[PDB]
Design a protein around this ligand. Sequence first.
Ligand SMILES: O=C1Cc2cc(Nc3nc(Cl)ncc3Br)ccc2N1
Ligand SMILES: O=C1Cc2cc(Nc3nc(Cl)ncc3Br)ccc2N1
Ligand SMILES: [Cl-]
Ligand SMILES: [Cl-]
Lengths: 4, 4, 124, 124
Amino acid sequence: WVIP
Amino acid sequence: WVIP
Amino acid sequence: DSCIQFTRHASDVLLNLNRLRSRDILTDVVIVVSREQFRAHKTVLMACSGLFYSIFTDQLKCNLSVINLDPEINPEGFCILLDFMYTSRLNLREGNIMAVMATAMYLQMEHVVDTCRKFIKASE
Amino acid sequence: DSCIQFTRHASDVLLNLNRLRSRDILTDVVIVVSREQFRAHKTVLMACSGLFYSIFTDQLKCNLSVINLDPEINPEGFCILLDFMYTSRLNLREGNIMAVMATAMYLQMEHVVDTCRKFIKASE
Ligand SMILES: O=C1Cc2cc(Nc3nc(Cl)ncc3Br)ccc2N1
Ligand SMILES: O=C1Cc2cc(Nc3nc(Cl)ncc3Br)ccc2N1
Ligand SMILES: [Cl-]
Ligand SMILES: [Cl-]
């Protein structure tokens, strides 16, 4: 999971 | 396009 | 093999599937969550959820145009997860994390369940 | 928004759509290319091809279970492109590049047409  |  | 790969292909396909969903094109099922209805593509639901995979591979249920979810399922939690299925983006907030995790466990969406458990463990 | 994103989601969805194709699950159309038949999902074809997008948004053609391609279309070229649609991998070879490019132009698959033109320009 990432900060888009 | 890339070499997978 | 000696194949080449187009990096953005999977993302572009999903973006187009979401455009079809937004315009209600070729949607083939309604998911009923209490008083709310959500139109979707059976294939996308199966590709994202262990529960929908089991439902639509069933020889009788594969032909249903309406699927009613358990009454304990929160419509907002379902909406957030349906958006995730079609975009890879999860709108996870302190106010919705419990409903989202409960819905992801029911839908059998392992990666969503995992991030919810991690975000909850951080706030305790 | 304040969304988080699951990097591998789009790829995992496409992998699952390809698994459904391999087991012939919920395929809803046959594409006829001369003597050959290819089963597929209308939504995936539309998401990958400008031609299939136009065909299945047509109020009459959207309901057809069989689509016949132009007789000039090569079945192997179509097969290679259908595999690409479901996997992001293109099996481009000196022996098939001309058929693949001609099929990608007909199907309106701009990125495939672009790499074919580049690979052809390099060999001249
Ligand atoms: O957390 C998750 C997400 C998910 C998706 C599917 N979907 C499919 N799985 C397989 Cl093996 N083949 C085709 C399809 Br469609 C099955 C289980 C799960 N569990
Ligand atoms: O080279 C390409 C690939 C492609 C795909 C689509 N598909 C869609 N396009 C739009 Cl805008 N909305 C929903 C869908 Br499905 C249209 C044109 C093209 N040209
Ligand atoms: Cl997931
Ligand atoms: Cl393309």
